[PDB]
Design a protein around this ligand. Structure first.
Ligand SMILES: Nc1ccn([C@H]2C[C@H](O)[C@@H](COP(=O)(O)O)O2)c(=O)n1
Ligand SMILES: Nc1ccn([C@H]2C[C@H](O)[C@@H](COP(=O)(O)O)O2)c(=O)n1
Ligand SMILES: [Ca+2]
Ligand SMILES: [Ca+2]
Ligand SMILES: [Ca+2]
Ligand SMILES: [Mg+2]
Ligand SMILES: [Mg+2]
Ligand SMILES: [Mg+2]
Ligand SMILES: [Mg+2]
Lengths: 213, 223
């Protein structure tokens, strides 16, 4: 039913708190990977990331300061980002993100762990706030209900750390940083690429159907 | 003479060959680091250098109009066909919008940093930008760490000053993901951090205006 995506843009967000705290994006990271790299993963002797990998990471000072929980987790604070001269989520962010996505062969499928409940509606809120739009044929995939569902067909924790520890028998790094989490998500995805690509070809939700937080 | 830069944007290019073949950018990577992260390089409890937490990054692959040389392709692990297979267009408007937006997110003035930048990266980037009629912010300056580190060793008185040699000399280990844009910038940033006080001082004194950078070659045409 959804359009067959050609590029999968894995993304992750660090923000100032949980959804009902009206959180602001402090960090966003995106790894763009063409479908063909996911269909036929490279392995040295273990998974290695695709050679052709467009990447974007941007830090931003939120207008609302962090929570203690969020700050210690992400290793970021409103003061820290200001000190490094980062402005908030503004037109410059939109122009860079839109440019980055236009560099990708469409249709695009955004991928995020627990995206339906957090990343997607938060990004939508920020984009809508600036009256910005994504390409019309853009869809999105939440690997959280997707992985749970795929396992039903065959109690376990489905946190990003639990999954990585389960598939690769090791600890992820650098956790709770936007770029680090996308890196972790991409490896997890690669480990289950055929099933997840299949999931996306059917269950991927239209970005237009994502409502602001 | 030069302005005091607030953001140091470390950049690396992968391209189809050496200057005399009129190479084209196939990959670009930029790490943006605020001066404060360089003035006081943060170090873990083990005392070893770690990359700044607040670190904007941009890596983009693109299919050049002309293909790679045997060497260039073998080095970078890139090829025209592989870039095409991953549906990457060439250095176009979308690259400029992304690049210019990325730089606009940085507190200026900006100092571009590249290893062998004067002889390769800066002229090549200038050629590609002129092709699309794109400009960087006027107050932008640039730093070549190759003559900088040579000059510093000459000052605080043969050795190779290649990226690999310097990383080996300063960190005594093999650099990971060598000859990839993002990998080489990562290597460059660590080298810079190893001697940040000196290089910052060098930048404040001898950083060249980007406006003085000449194109590696006059591009054929368009758009
Ligand atoms: N128990 C938690 C965990 C995370 N967060 C916030 C901080 C993070 O910026 C964001 C989740 O990002 P991530 O899952 O990548 O750590 O939500 C929160 O408010 N409470
Ligand atoms: N002996 C060399 C050194 C460099 N290059 C080209 C390939 C790279 O795309 C670009 C930058 O080199 P490097 O990856 O080593 O930084 O110059 C080349 O063709 N032959
Ligand atoms: Ca703006
Ligand atoms: Ca274990
Ligand atoms: Ca070199
Ligand atoms: Mg997240
Ligand atoms: Mg995260
Ligand atoms: Mg180089
Ligand atoms: Mg390089």
């Amino acid at each position: 039913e959804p359009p067959r995506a050609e590029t999968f843009v894995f993304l992750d967000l660090e923000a100032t708190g949980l959804p009902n705290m009206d959180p602001e994006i402090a960090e966003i990271s995106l790894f763009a990977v063409h479908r063909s790299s996911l269909e036929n993963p490279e392995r040295d002797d273990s998974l290695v990331l695709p050679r052709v990998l467009d990447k974007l990471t941007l830090c931003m000072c939120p207008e609302r300061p962090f929570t203690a929980k969020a700050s210690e987790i992400t290793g970021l604070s409103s003061e820290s980002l200001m000190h490094c001269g980062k402005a908030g989520f503004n037109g410059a962010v939109v122009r860079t993100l839109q440019g980055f996505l236009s560099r990708q062969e469409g249709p695009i499928c955004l991928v995020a762990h627990n995206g339906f409940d957090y990343d997607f509606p938060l990004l939508c809120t920020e984009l809508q706030r600036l009256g910005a739009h994504l390409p019309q044929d853009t869809v999105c995939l939440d690997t959280l209900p997707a992985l749970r569902g795929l396992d039903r067909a065959h109690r376990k924790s489905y946190s990003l750390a639990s999954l990585f520890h389960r598939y690769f028998q090791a600890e992820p790094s650098a956790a709770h940083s936007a770029e680090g989490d996308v890196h972790t998500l991409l490896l997890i995805f690669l480990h289950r690429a055929p099933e997840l690509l299949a999931w996306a070809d059917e269950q991927a939700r239209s970005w237009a159907h994502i409502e602001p937080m």
